[PDB]
Amino acid sequence: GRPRPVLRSVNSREPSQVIFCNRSPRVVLPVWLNFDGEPQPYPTLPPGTGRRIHSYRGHLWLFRDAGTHDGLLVNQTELFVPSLNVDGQPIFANITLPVYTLKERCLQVVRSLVKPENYRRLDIVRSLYEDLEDHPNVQKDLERLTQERIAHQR
């Protein structure tokens, strides 16, 4: 009686045609969660570009800045699950920027200008060192998403 990771693709073997549409200013990394909940990096999309790709029903994707791992949205939410194509039409995955808090946006920029080695050189309140060092990552987001999921059910 072992649970499987809740955030994983279902192994359907049922093809689904999808168009990844990068409507962000970032280089996008598509991340596919495999059948064991392990994230797999896919080829990146430059900004302003769209690409018709081959996936499957019940597979699970998310999208990150390929340079910094900042989280992006897809169809206004965090995860994307293809269904079966109806009447010969592709499914669209519209990848956009979130409205970041000013704080997170500021952290993104400082992080882009300062090497992690040097964060504690900066003349700012100690707690911002912890914030700068807390790089966005998928592991953290999977945790957060699961937690939000469990909150919604309970």
Partner: protein, 104 residues
Amino acid sequence: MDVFLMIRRHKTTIFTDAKESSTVFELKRIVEGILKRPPDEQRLYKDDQLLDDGKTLGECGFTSQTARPQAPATVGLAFRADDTFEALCIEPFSSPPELPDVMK
């Protein structure tokens, strides 16, 4: 589309939005709601250039491409009382310090 503005006089800045189709008169009716000075006591500028009440914001040069929520366009404000006209004077914001070494 929507245009996003900073109305500036002396050391006061008003953040407001409007339409490209909006008139300068309509814009002054906005400022009146905030500062309690009627349109006829207001003079609005784009840089050195006085704006006609009848013209629209788009006609004055205020486009959605150049008047964005994250980088709004500036409109100069100077008051008038009958035959007396206040000079347009907008005090600059402060300057950032020199960029720290660890960012260079």
